Design a protein around this ligand. Structure first.
Ligand code: CU
Ligand code: CU
Ligand code: CU
Ligand code: CU
Length: 439
């Protein structure tokens, strides 16, 4: 129908989003070919859930997979008793997630499986969808009058009409696929009807990075992972690591066709080489450039003025502890560590106090990029690689290139046991995850 494919939207009704969603192997048409994927709601991506603060969400997940699964409400600062990373929904069983959307929340979030050891294959097979929290700021004219679209960035590889299996190298690097899709479509065309576009961006890939650039145009960052910036930030490109989100304004400057591209980016993935007594790992180097979509500008584009301001970032109490988390790798074993340990669901690694603020220094001592994710407690990135972060906004995933230190301001919110881990999900399944208990 519409030239631009976008997941179906389910909205709350009278302050309640009540929905039954089954995770099921589903025959689909994807990228001009028939394939059986694992989907929520029979679609890839799963449906977009659009809610408002203080809405009630009642989501019954029926597991029709041959293996156990669960849901992670990625980015939502709700209770880890609801967003429970240790829950197992057995095959054939159902579980109902009921939570209230926090009052002070806005932006693009998402849901996907989080059963340790099975995350990478289930996510890669198509189990993912977006959750949008619409705010009163969406009513200001500079945003309301913009044309809005969600872009779910997720790649795929097919073998015999099914998701390609994980190889040993996939477990080491994180699996990337040759089909680089937007909303499950291969290089769709967006024929813009307005000159200002508001694009909600989601990197739902296992491991692929998206070094985003729109031909002949800057991007205006207005929101990060878990909330608005304080004011629009002009960027020439925008890197989205696995699990990250962003919202940008695009102000179309002239008529024409403009490529939105994932420019070449070296995240440190490795190959293997044998050159006579060698048999050692070699960098894959940068990814080849990918076209994500074709953007057709309307006739005589006159974009709206940018919003002068978005949302003030909260003033946070002085922190009461500093934590250091060091990431390391054993590439040939495909094992990944935090402070020298692999995940153990029985072991509590960190113990913090709710409503206190902590400083987290996360240090990448590996040679690969590692996008560090913390559940339940959104954070403020202060600096990465010794460079001050140029905006204030809630994030829940922060990318660390090799050698870099990120300093995060972490306010602890809901009490309970939750996790932190690399969002190259193969690395999480292979041990790069730890346990935080908030009391
Ligand atoms: Cu996630
Ligand atoms: Cu998460
Ligand atoms: Cu990693
Ligand atoms: Cu997680």
């Amino acid at each position: 129908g519409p030239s631009f494919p976008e997941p179906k939207v389910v909205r709350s009704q009278g302050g309640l989003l009540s929905l039954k969603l089954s995770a099921t192997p589903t025959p689909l048409a994807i990228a001009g070919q028939r394939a059986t994927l694992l989907t929520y709601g029979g679609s890839f991506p799963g449906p977009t859930l659009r809610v408002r603060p203080r809405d009630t969400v009642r989501l019954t997940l029926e597991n029709r997979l041959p293996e156990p699964t669960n849901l992670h409400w990625h980015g939502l600062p709700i209770s880890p008793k609801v967003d429970d990373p240790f829950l197992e929904i057995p095959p054939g069983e159902s579980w109902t997630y009921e939570f209230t959307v926090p009052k002070e929340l806005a932006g693009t979030f998402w849901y996907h499986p989080h059963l340790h050891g099975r995350v990478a294959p289930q996510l890669f097979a198509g189990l993912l969808g977006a959750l949008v929290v619409e705010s009163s700021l969406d009513a200001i004219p500079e945003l309301r009058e913009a044309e809005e679209h969600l872009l779910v960035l997720k790649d795929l590889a097919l073998q015999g009409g099914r998701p390609a299996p994980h190889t040993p190298m996939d477990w080491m690097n994180g699996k990337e696929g040759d089909l680089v899709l937007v909303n499950g479509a291969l290089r769709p065309t967006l024929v813009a009807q307005k000159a200002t576009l508001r694009l909600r961006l989601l990197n739902a890939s296992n491991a692929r990075y998206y070094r985003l650039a729109l031909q002949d145009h800057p991007l205006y960052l207005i929101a990060a992972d878990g909330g608005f910036l304080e004011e629009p930030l002009e960027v020439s490109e925008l890197l989205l690591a696995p699990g990250e989100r962003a919202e940008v304004l695009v102000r179309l400057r002239k008529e024409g066709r403009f490529l939105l591209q994932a420019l070449p980016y070296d995240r440190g993935a490795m190959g293997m080489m044998d050159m006579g007594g060698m048999a050692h790992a070699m960098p894959q180097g940068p990814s080849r450039p990918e076209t994500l979509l074709y953007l057709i500008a309307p006739k005589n584009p006159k974009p709206l003025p940018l919003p002068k301001a978005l949302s003030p970032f909260p003033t946070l109490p002085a922190p009461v502890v500093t934590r250091r988390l060091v990431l390391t790798e054993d590439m040939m074993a495909a094992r990944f560590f935090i402070n020298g340990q692999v995940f153990d669901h029985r072991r509590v690694d960190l113990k913090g106090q709710a409503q206190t603020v902590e400083v987290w220094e996360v240090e990448n001592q590996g040679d690969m990029d590692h996008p560090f994710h913390l559940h339940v407690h959104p954070f403020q990135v202060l600096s990465v690689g010794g460079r001050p972060f140029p905006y204030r906004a809630w994030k829940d995933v922060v990318n660390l290139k090799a050698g870099e230190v990120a300093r995060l301001l972490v306010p602890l919110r809901e009490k309970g046991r939750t996790v932190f881990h690399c969002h190259i999900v193969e690395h999480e399944d292979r041990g790069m995850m730890g346990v935080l208990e908030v009391g």
